[PDB]
Amino acid sequence: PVCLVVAMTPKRGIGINNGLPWPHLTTDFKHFSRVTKTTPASRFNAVVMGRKTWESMPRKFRPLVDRLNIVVSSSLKEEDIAAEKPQAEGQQRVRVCASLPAALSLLEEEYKDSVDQIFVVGGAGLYEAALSLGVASHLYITRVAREFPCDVFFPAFPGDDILSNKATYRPIFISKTFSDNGVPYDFVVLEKRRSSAAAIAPVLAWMDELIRAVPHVHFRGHEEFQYLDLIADIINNGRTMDDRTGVGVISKFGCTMRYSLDQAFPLLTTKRVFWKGVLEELLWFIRGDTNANHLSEKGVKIWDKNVTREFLDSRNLPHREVGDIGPGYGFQWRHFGAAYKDMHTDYTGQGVDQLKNVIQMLRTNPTDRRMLMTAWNPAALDEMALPPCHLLCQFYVNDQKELSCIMYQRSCDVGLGVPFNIASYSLLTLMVAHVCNLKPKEFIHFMGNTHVYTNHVEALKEQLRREPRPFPIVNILNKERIKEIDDFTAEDFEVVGYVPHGRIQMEMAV
Amino acid sequence: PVCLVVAMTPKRGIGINNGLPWPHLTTDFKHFSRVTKTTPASRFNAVVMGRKTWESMPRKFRPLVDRLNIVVSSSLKEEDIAAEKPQAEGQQRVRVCASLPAALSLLEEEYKDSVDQIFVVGGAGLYEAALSLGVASHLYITRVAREFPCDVFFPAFPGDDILSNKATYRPIFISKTFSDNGVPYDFVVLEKRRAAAIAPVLAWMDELIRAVPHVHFRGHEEFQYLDLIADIINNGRTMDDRTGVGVISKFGCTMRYSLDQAFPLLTTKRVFWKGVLEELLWFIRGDTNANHLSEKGVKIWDKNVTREFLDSRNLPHREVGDIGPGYGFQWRHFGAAYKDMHTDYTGQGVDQLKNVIQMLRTNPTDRRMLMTAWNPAALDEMALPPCHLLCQFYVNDQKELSCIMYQRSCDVGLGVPFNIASYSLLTLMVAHVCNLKPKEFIHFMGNTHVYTNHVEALKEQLRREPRPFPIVNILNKERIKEIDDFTAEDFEVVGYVPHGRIQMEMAV
Numbered sequence A: 001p002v003c004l005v006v007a008m009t010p011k012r013g014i015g016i017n018n019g020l021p022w023p024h025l026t027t028d029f030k031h032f033s034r035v036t037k038t039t040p041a042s043r044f045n046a047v048v049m050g051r052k053t054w055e056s057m058p059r060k061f062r063p064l065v066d067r068l069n070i071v072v073s074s075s076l077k078e079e080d081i082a083a084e085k086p087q088a089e090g091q092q093r094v095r096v097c098a099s100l101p102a103a104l105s106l107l108e109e110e111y112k113d114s115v116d117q118i119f120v121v122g123g124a125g126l127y128e129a130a131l132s133l134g135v136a137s138h139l140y141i142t143r144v145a146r147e148f149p150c151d152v153f154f155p156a157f158p159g160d161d162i163l164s165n166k167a168t169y170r171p172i173f174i175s176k177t178f179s180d181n182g183v184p185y186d187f188v189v190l191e192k193r194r195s196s197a198a199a200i201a202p203v204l205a206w207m208d209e210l211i212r213a214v215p216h217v218h219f220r221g222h223e224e225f226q227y228l229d230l231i232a233d234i235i236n237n238g239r240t241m242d243d244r245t246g247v248g249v250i251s252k253f254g255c256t257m258r259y260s261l262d263q264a265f266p267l268l269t270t271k272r273v274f275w276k277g278v279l280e281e282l283l284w285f286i287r288g289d290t291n292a293n294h295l296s297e298k299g300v301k302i303w304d305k306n307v308t309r310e311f312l313d314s315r316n317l318p319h320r321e322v323g324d325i326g327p328g329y330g331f332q333w334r335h336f337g338a339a340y341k342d343m344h345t346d347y348t349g350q351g352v353d354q355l356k357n358v359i360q361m362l363r364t365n366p367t368d369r370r371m372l373m374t375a376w377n378p379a380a381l382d383e384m385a386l387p388p389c390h391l392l393c394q395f396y397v398n399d400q401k402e403l404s405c406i407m408y409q410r411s412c413d414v415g416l417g418v419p420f421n422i423a424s425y426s427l428l429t430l431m432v433a434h435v436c437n438l439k440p441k442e443f444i445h446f447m448g449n450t451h452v453y454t455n456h457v458e459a460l461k462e463q464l465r466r467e468p469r470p471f472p473i474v475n476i477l478n479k480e481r482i483k484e485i486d487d488f489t490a491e492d493f494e495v496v497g498y499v500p501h502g503r504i505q506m507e508m509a510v
Numbered sequence B: 001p002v003c004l005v006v007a008m009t010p011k012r013g014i015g016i017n018n019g020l021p022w023p024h025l026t027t028d029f030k031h032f033s034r035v036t037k038t039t040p041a042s043r044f045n046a047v048v049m050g051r052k053t054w055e056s057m058p059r060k061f062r063p064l065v066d067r068l069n070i071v072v073s074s075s076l077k078e079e080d081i082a083a084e085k086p087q088a089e090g091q092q093r094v095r096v097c098a099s100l101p102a103a104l105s106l107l108e109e110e111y112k113d114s115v116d117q118i119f120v121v122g123g124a125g126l127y128e129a130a131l132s133l134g135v136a137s138h139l140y141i142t143r144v145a146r147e148f149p150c151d152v153f154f155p156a157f158p159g160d161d162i163l164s165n166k167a168t169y170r171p172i173f174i175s176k177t178f179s180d181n182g183v184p185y186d187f188v189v190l191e192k193r194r195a196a197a198i199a200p201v202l203a204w205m206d207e208l209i210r211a212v213p214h215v216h217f218r219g220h221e222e223f224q225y226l227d228l229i230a231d232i233i234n235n236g237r238t239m240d241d242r243t244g245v246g247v248i249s250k251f252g253c254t255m256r257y258s259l260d261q262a263f264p265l266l267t268t269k270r271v272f273w274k275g276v277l278e279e280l281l282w283f284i285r286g287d288t289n290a291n292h293l294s295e296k297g298v299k300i301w302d303k304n305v306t307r308e309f310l311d312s313r314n315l316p317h318r319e320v321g322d323i324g325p326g327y328g329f330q331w332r333h334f335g336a337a338y339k340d341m342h343t344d345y346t347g348q349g350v351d352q353l354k355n356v357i358q359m360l361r362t363n364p365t366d367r368r369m370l371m372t373a374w375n376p377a378a379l380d381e382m383a384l385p386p387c388h389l390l391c392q393f394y395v396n397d398q399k400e401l402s403c404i405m406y407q408r409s410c411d412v413g414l415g416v417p418f419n420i421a422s423y424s425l426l427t428l429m430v431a432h433v434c435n436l437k438p439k440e441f442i443h444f445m446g447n448t449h450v451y452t453n454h455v456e457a458l459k460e461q462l463r464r465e466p467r468p469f470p471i472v473n474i475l476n477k478e479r480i481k482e483i484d485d486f487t488a489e490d491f492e493v494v495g496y497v498p499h500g501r502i503q504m505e506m507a508v
């Protein structure tokens, strides 16, 4: 009974020029070491590797310490390796076998009572052989989110859908996303499938009491499970209600999520998120721009259905031009309380610049607890095309110059809006962190009326069948040029290692 | 090995005039039945009771079905009981014994292989006898939070600190607060003390202060607050602060409290209720004169409206006691031009409270039922920027009202228990005025922290196990039709039995 351990690009790439495709991934090596070395005493674990894999390792690390080293080869001889370096006391002698079945028989014959767990460590020859023999029970895969140039590949296998879009190997473990040297990765484990509290228990018994996302995944480290469990939760336990749009709603009240920003970026992978949109909208907010046609001209039509002549009239605003959101979001952000006229007016210097206040406070007095920005203006609500959903955000600096952000959202379209909102404010945190010389730490999402529309239910149930991929990294390009929040452009950002599942069509409740 | 099963007032009272002191508590009766009946087949449980207990039960329910009934009496005889009512099919014949030891001997002698668990069910003679013999391994106590006239009391026992203020019996289970017929109560259980291949990956990913760690089932909703305290001290970050006093803080924390059964006025330290009620009415008035609270014995705003603090805020034109355009003001007059605490602002600004209520009364599915105190245009005019800055309301299928409150800065030691009670009361008030049922209060916290000069007192607080939550009743319901109709005397707190007050200085 054998276990395989691999690091892999989304296209199954494992190596190039008898070396690793990526820069050093320290956490991955910690992982490789820990899994292969650990045992309950008398016994040790075995690592079976191909000849080139052996030769790819640098001298000082070979043989792998505290593990029996077996090299599958026909050219290399046991004495070749012995002559390579003197065998350290207490360590096992490096054995060589002609094939994998040979290496397994050697383990059975001379190493019973001596070895615990057998690990196939590479390369493509041994991985393919172990899969052909079907002797592999578990796969320890490190999913390198980025694609690199590779000449050697891990073989295709049933269940390789965990890497990229297309007896089975099903994920039973998915971790949160890590990152080393600008490379995002996570860890999955696949499986071959084909009177103490006893007396307390009866009171427990009478007090005690359907849809789950990828139920087989037992360890749910990936931070996207928050969102997937949130959808299930609302469908399971939510209340069917009437709604402004006329479309049905299953709603919940006061839900919550939080996402790390220090390793990777929470751009949801279980469906493709329109990143061009979030970026272009966020920048639009930051200008204090209130013309939806500027977004519409860039291919970002997210506000068009809510700025039509028809919708502006149902809002009792016949004096609004097509594309005028009124003084919402960006306007209150940069010009709180200023008297609105139209989208074409210059409001420079009017009202309160909340964003500039927050940023200056972050830069001088980061322990202040009044670092808040609100879009909710009860005086101007009837002038907006739609009252803001994400209406407030608060900032917080800790011991280690690490920035976190809370955003309150009164109304959350789980299916369509939520993934977008997570990305939009997580980006804002990165931007503010850079400008104030801070490290981004965490985005915290506080949700009011949290709902899925009835016409989304079927699509979301399909989405729950997909296991999340590692999160991407978002890099700020041109860091030296950008010094203020108004310096960011649409070309100052790089999404690296984004490998989502396919787009899912969901109609915007108008 | 015996288990006791009881319902009890905070003063140990259990009976009056050979009957129960309180109105009918249906959930307790369900509890009693379930605990005493349940078995894994071949066996049944035994209920040992005194003669007066047996006589207190109504005819139809006695003997207790599917349980061997043992009555302790020198007067009553086995044939008296037999003649009383015809023995039904499959039910044990009621047995009479001269003492508790005798009844336990009868269980050993004639009922080995037959009975599973033995339950002492009352009353005053048996409980005391069982505790004296030291044969009780577990106590099933239903803590009735209200006091009632009683002539029969459960005996004083080591660890009766779970009932009220002053081998051992330690709680190992505390449930959420229930209520029936205007009586709050909960359930405690005391105790005599005196896929492996996944794991290697888990271990490498991995790397002190806990409240009442011995209590293993943590159903009581106050555990949220208590665990929040522990969580900040363990995992919080020590920080500088506006007040110069040290702070250990976390960011973005949540709690939620049910309002359908009881009221989350914390029990692990006494909460200044008079204060919460007086301030909340003061908010609803749109009143910005802290001297109106101060005159009523509510001095919570005094330190922040002194001549000195007003000047440190660069407001030398502010008369002592003037919070500027604070919460009350923004609620009823959002965006109105402020003069001083003596001016009438009727008809000025937006009345957010009136809008929220009317929307709840006419269109409860609307998702814009919000009230905000945060006005960035007027922050520099206020004595203190609002901490609780935003609240949102929600109505469900069953006309049940829930309320979220976002707070930017949380003094966990001092402010938080006050704020939980404050907005929970607002929800009750708003529910009443809009013909609705209060369901839930949800607490969203920004900067969550405990001041360094509170940590010692908070550790003392964590050694206290919570008591059942009290009930808040709105008196004079008929008279009250609008949110402005509530007075100080329209409220009644029922069965509030907290631990002693803990002194904690306000970081000025």
Ligand SMILES: NC(=O)C1=CN([C@@H]2O[C@H](COP(=O)(O)OP(=O)(O)OC[C@H]3O[C@@H](n4cnc5c(N)ncnc54)[C@H](OP(=O)(O)O)[C@@H]3O)[C@@H](O)[C@H]2O)C=CC1
Binding pocket: A005, A006, A007, A008, A014, A015, A016, A017, A018, A019, A020, A021, A049, A050, A051, A052, A053, A054, A056, A072, A073, A074, A075, A076, A098, A099, A100, A121, A122, A123, A124, A125, A126, A129, A152
């Ligand atoms: N990131 C990851 O997960 C890993 C990546 N890698 C990368 O991949 C590369 C190594 O992979 P690869 O090129 O496939 O090298 P291999 O380790 O598969 O080397 C092939 C050699 O091993 C022996 N061998 C291989 N297959 C068989 C077989 N079916 N039967 C008998 N003997 C066999 C032979 O030795 P002989 O010549 O004596 O016949 C053969 O020449 C390196 O570039 C390395 O960086 C490697 C391991 C893990």
Ligand SMILES: NC(=O)C1=CN([C@@H]2O[C@H](COP(=O)(O)OP(=O)(O)OC[C@H]3O[C@@H](n4cnc5c(N)ncnc54)[C@H](OP(=O)(O)O)[C@@H]3O)[C@@H](O)[C@H]2O)C=CC1
Binding pocket: B005, B006, B007, B008, B014, B015, B016, B017, B018, B019, B020, B021, B049, B050, B051, B052, B053, B054, B056, B072, B073, B074, B075, B076, B098, B099, B100, B121, B122, B123, B124, B125, B126, B129, B152
């Ligand atoms: N809140 C609760 O959970 C409960 C409350 N109650 C309340 O308590 C009231 C009665 O309780 P209480 O007054 O204690 O009556 P008990 O149930 O203790 O019965 C007393 C009688 O039982 C016999 N007895 C009990 N203990 C002994 C002993 N150690 N040695 C000898 N004989 C014994 C005697 O019978 P005799 O004199 O005939 O020889 C005695 O008169 C009930 O009316 C009810 O209202 C009762 C049960 C549970």
Ligand SMILES: C#CCN(Cc1ccc2[nH]c(N)nc(=O)c2c1)c1ccc(C(=O)N[C@@H](CCC(=O)O)C(=O)O)cc1
Binding pocket: A272, A273, A274, A277, A301, A302, A303, A306, A413, A416, A417, A418, A419, A420, A421, A508, A509, A510
């Ligand atoms: C939230 C927000 C900003 N907004 C503004 C906006 C305005 C009114 C709304 N109204 C309703 N009912 N739901 C919304 O999500 C919504 C969103 C958006 C509007 C549309 C799309 C949209 O059509 N979907 C994208 C997919 C992006 C995604 O995966 O989320 C697309 O491909 O067109 C996205 C964001």
Ligand SMILES: C#CCN(Cc1ccc2[nH]c(N)nc(=O)c2c1)c1ccc(C(=O)N[C@@H](CCC(=O)O)C(=O)O)cc1
Binding pocket: B270, B271, B272, B299, B300, B301, B304, B411, B414, B415, B416, B417, B418, B419, B506, B507, B508
């Ligand atoms: C929050 C809030 C409202 N407020 C207003 C208020 C104003 C400034 C503040 N400043 C600081 N630093 N912490 C606070 O908790 C605080 C609270 C209060 C102020 C004081 C007390 C107080 O002295 N303690 C009460 C005990 C009540 C309780 O158990 O919470 C007392 O007995 O005097 C309570 C509430």
Ligand SMILES: Nc1ncc(N2CCN(c3ccc(Cl)c(Cl)c3)CC2)c(N)n1
Binding pocket: A005, A006, A007, A019, A020, A028, A029, A032, A053, A056, A057, A058, A061, A121, A122, A141, A142
């Ligand atoms: N997740 C995961 N990372 C690396 C490996 N290995 C691939 C190559 N390899 C290795 C060891 C040490 C060094 Cl220094 C070098 Cl350059 C290569 C042996 C271990 C694996 N099997 N799984």
Ligand SMILES: Nc1ncc(N2CCN(c3ccc(Cl)c(Cl)c3)CC2)c(N)n1
Binding pocket: B005, B006, B007, B028, B029, B032, B056, B057, B058, B061, B120, B121, B122, B140, B141, B142
């Ligand atoms: N937790 C806890 N609740 C109730 C009881 N009682 C059960 C026995 N008892 C009783 C039972 C049923 C009826 Cl109908 C009557 Cl009138 C009295 C008196 C109170 C207890 N022993 N423990």
Ligand SMILES: O=c1ccn([C@H]2C[C@H](O)[C@@H](COP(=O)(O)O)O2)c(=O)[nH]1
Binding pocket: A244, A245, A386, A388, A389, A390, A411, A412, A413, A414, A416, A417, A418, A421, B367, B368
């Ligand atoms: O940033 C946003 C803005 C809007 N919405 C969705 C949620 C609600 O379904 C709808 C808001 O319209 P009202 O129902 O609040 O009128 O749009 C979002 O999810 N995110």
Ligand SMILES: O=c1ccn([C@H]2C[C@H](O)[C@@H](COP(=O)(O)O)O2)c(=O)[nH]1
Binding pocket: A369, B242, B384, B385, B386, B387, B388, B409, B410, B411, B412, B414, B415, B416, B419
């Ligand atoms: O309703 C309130 C108001 C204030 N505070 C606490 C939180 C902060 O510790 C302090 C206010 O200080 P600043 O927010 O002004 O820094 O008082 C509360 O707990 N509740």
